[PDB]
Amino acid sequence: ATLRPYLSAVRATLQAALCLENFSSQVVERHNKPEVEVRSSKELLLQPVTISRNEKEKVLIEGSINSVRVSIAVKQADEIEKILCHKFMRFMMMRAENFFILRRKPVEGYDISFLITNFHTEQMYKHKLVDFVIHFMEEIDKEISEMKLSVNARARIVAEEFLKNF
Amino acid sequence: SLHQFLLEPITCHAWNRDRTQIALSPNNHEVHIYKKNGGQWVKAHELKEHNGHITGIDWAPKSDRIVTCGADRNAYVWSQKDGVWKPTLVILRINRAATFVKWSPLENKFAVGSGARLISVCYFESENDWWVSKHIKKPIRSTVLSLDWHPNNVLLAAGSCDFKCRVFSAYIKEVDEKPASTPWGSKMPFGQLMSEFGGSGTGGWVHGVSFSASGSRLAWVSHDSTVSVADASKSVQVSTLKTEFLPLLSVSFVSENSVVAAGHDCCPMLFNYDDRGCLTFVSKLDIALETLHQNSITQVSIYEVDKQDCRKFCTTGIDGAMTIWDFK
Amino acid sequence: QLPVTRTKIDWNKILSALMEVMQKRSKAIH
Amino acid sequence: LLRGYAFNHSADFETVRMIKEKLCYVGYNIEQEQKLALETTVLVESYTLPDGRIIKVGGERFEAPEALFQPHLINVEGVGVAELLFNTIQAADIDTRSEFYKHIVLSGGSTMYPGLPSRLERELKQLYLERVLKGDVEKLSKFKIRIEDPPRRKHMVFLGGAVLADIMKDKDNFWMTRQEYQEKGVRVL
Amino acid sequence: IVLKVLISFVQSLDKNGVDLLMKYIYKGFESPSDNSSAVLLQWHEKALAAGGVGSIVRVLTAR
């Protein structure tokens, strides 16, 4: 309806940016580092691109010759959604040595942020990482919207059991 | 016809004269030589001297010698004088990582493209038995990614990350003999810029360059999903076509009129160049993914006897699979 | 006070071609 | 040891040496190294062992090699390689000091870390721009400093020996004859 | 600035103005106004079929 074109556009933009190569540094000898974190040569960087649906949900993609950075912000309706989103992202960021493609601290103004290097594109396929990001952007909304109803449904039984006795 | 050697990627591949042996580098600091015993590929030899990632190999057929270059700022020349291959040392005098290597048509010099804004042309000296290099560095501003040689053993094409495709001359007077006159120019000292291209506004990094059999035409692919052909017979003129597909990582001439390309779409393609100066797309050649290769193709070579009469071509890439494609 | 070598001159070796050959190495390497 | 990985001193000396040889490097700017180590996970690499275990080495790659430039981290009193080089060049007669600045050669297997060539130049330039020529940043261009380090650093002791035995192979004064020790028992060459 | 008339609404299909339309579309996403985002996203799919996946690279390497 409205989410499907957004996911389609993010898919199309990601497919045109994950075309990476290998590149040793031309400043310090025999150091292979990503050329989007360490910003040492303007020629190797691509123009950043932003895609959005409304005024509070958008994706920023920053390209390079051997690294891509993808920062995503998610939906928030009320305070409970806000704090649950914050808790969930802090949970994921703590376990970043297992999530090979997750950045420890996000870019300012965005909730979650991925960093993909050419090593992660050679050790894995290409379309499955894009599918993983598309799964990521929707499964989190499903999970938090389920956790809200789960917490709401845990108060009825407690209140009923307390009021039952007396 | 697909064959899967290893699950790891193939950085680079080299063929020999009889198309019996193949040299591969499975993304490590080693080179593996395989032969064909009947109808199955079985590994033959291992070559291990580098202490860094290997980035380029080439095989001089007539002399039967393998040149290897890698990211440890080294290059070696492997030769077979007994059953075991042995190396010979090359002095390169670069301080950054090498990126490409290629033999010459006469097999007397070889060109190495590196990331120190240099092109190193190396030739042999026997008074103390090693290879000595000369540098081309004047108009280059960034790292070179592709190289090619002219049939007349002098001129040299180069593509670099500074959005330019250049044609230099690499005449070494100690080894080579005096050349004739070409449409590209007349006065050919060493390290003199003969021609330069790359003016298109939104230029991207050039990944591959190639000359034609006649030697009077150049072709190159860019990272803005464009292919371009430069002619020099009637005049110094260009024709650029803007494809609607992902970037292309290699290019090679099949004849005077047709050019074959490959890239991240995992499918080789054929373009046609008319005599009047027009590029037109023709077709793909491969009509999980619906494609034999499962990842980006990194290198395209010719199985047949090259641009004089080409019938089949070989593709290899990151998926670990090597494929032979026949036009007929 | 002392020569460049910062030592007493060794009279035995004073009382009693590598440089020719080394020039080609110096040219090729550098 | 401070990650849950216990390697004993004696029997696992040659297992950690492969880790040192494969994954270690000297940082150019410490600041960007720490920024990438704190806010990014592109430094952690997995190493397989003969037993079959997989260990993970992270920010420890660029801490181990820096005992050379800062010697006090493992309880050694001194000045470090960069400053000791300065104290050695600035201790000879004035005329020959320029002859040593231009020609410094690195040898041995413990100078093959990535970046060790590119750090000594910066350290010497900064140590020579605040100790000798204090301020006045114009004349450093005329002051030429160059470090030579070919990719054949390990065997440079051998290769030199491969030349000196080739030139002087024939003339019988370079060698100590067997008959010299049959009568004299000492040597003056 | 004529993107408002475009919001109120392939056309020429010159095979070079598709890049210009792509540039305008991707530069228009930085300033949403509660109705432009939906129509711009709807035309992104239409323009992608006519132009191709390669066109996204041209705006990405436009610099």
CATH of residue D119: 3.30.420.40
> Are D69 and D81 part of one and the same domain?
no
Number of domains in chain B: 1
For residues D63 and D3, state if they share a domain: yes
Do D26 and D56 share a domain, yes or no?
Answer: yes
Considering the domain architecture, whether residues D61 and D83 belong to the same structural domain is answered as no
Residues D9 and D65 in one domain: yes
Q: Which amino acid is at A76?
A: Q
Residues of C in contact with B125 (CB under 8 A): 28
Residue D70 shares a structural domain with residue D27: yes
Contact A19 B161 (CB under 8 A): no
Question: Which CATH number is B31's domain given?
Answer: 2.130.10.10
- Give A-chain residues touching E37 at CB under 8 angstroms: 52-54
Taking contacts as CB-CB distances below 8 angstroms, the residues of chain D near B72 are 151
- The widest CA-to-CA distance across chain E, in whole angstroms, is 31
Minimum distance, in Å, between the CA of residue E32 and any CA atom of chain B: 27
D145 and D106 housed in the same domain: yes
Contact B244 E52 (CB under 8 A): yes
D77 is in an annotated binding site: no
For residue A101, what are the contacts with CB-CB under 8 A and spacing of at least 6?
A114, A115, A116, A120, A129
Kindly calculate the radius of gyration of chain E based on its CA atoms and give it in whole angstroms: 11
Estimate the share of chain D in helix, then strand, then coil, as percent rounded to the nearest 5: 45, 5, 50
- Which residues span the domain enclosing A61? 1-166
Let me know whether D91 and D125 are in one domain.
yes
Residues of chain B in Cβ contact (below 8 Å) with chain A: 9, 27, 52-53, 71-73, 95-97, 115-117, 142-143, 161-163, 205, 246-247, 264, 289, 294-296, 318
The tally of domains found in chain A comes to 1
Q: D58 and D14, same structural domain?
A: yes
CA distance C30 to chain B (A): 8
Identity of the residue in A31, A100, A103 whose CB atom sits nearest the CB atom of D40: A103
- Whether D28 sits inside 8 A of A105 (CB atoms) is no
Question: What's the rounded Cα separation, in Å, for the pair A146 and D164?
Answer: 80
* Sign of the torsion angle spanned by Cα atoms B12, B14, B20, B25: negative
D1 shares its domain with D72: yes
Burial class (CB in 10 A: 0-12, 13-18, 19+), D119: buried
Nearest CA in chain C to D96: C4
> Which 41-60 residues of chain E touch chain B by CB within 8 A?
51-55, 57-58
Measured between beta carbons, the chain A residues lying within 8 angstroms of D149 are: none
SS (H, E, C) B266-292: CCCEEEEECCCCCEEEEEECCCCCCCC
SS3 label, residue D42: coil
Collect all residues of chain D within an 8 Å Cβ-Cβ radius of residue A37. 35-36, 40, 42
Residues 6+ apart with CB under 8 A from B231: B216, B217, B237, B238, B239, B277
Residue labelled with tokens 């049959």: D182
On whether both D71 and D2 belong to a single domain, the answer is: yes
Given an 8 Å threshold on Cβ–Cβ distance, is D112 in contact with B51?
yes
- Cβ contact E29–A5 (<8 Å): no
> B89–D152: do the CB atoms touch at under 8 Å?
yes
Residue-number span of the structural domain to which B94 is assigned: 2-326
**Which string of b and e fits B76-92 if b means at least 16 CB within 10 Å?**
bbbeeeeeebeeeebbb
Domain identity same for D1 and D35: yes
DSSP assignment string, B94-147: -SS-EEEEEE-TTSSEEEEEETTTEEEEEEEETTTTEEEEEEE-SS--S-EEEE
φ/ψ of E50, rounded to 5, equals -75, -40
DSSP run (H or E) holding B32:
strand B31-36
Strand partners, B57: B68
Contact B196, B139 (CB under 8 A): yes
Method: cryo-EM
Domain of residue D28 covers: 1-76
| Helix D116-127 and helix D80-89, axial crossing angle in degrees, nearest 10 | 50
Q: Which residues of B touch A125 (CB under 8 A)?
A: 294-295
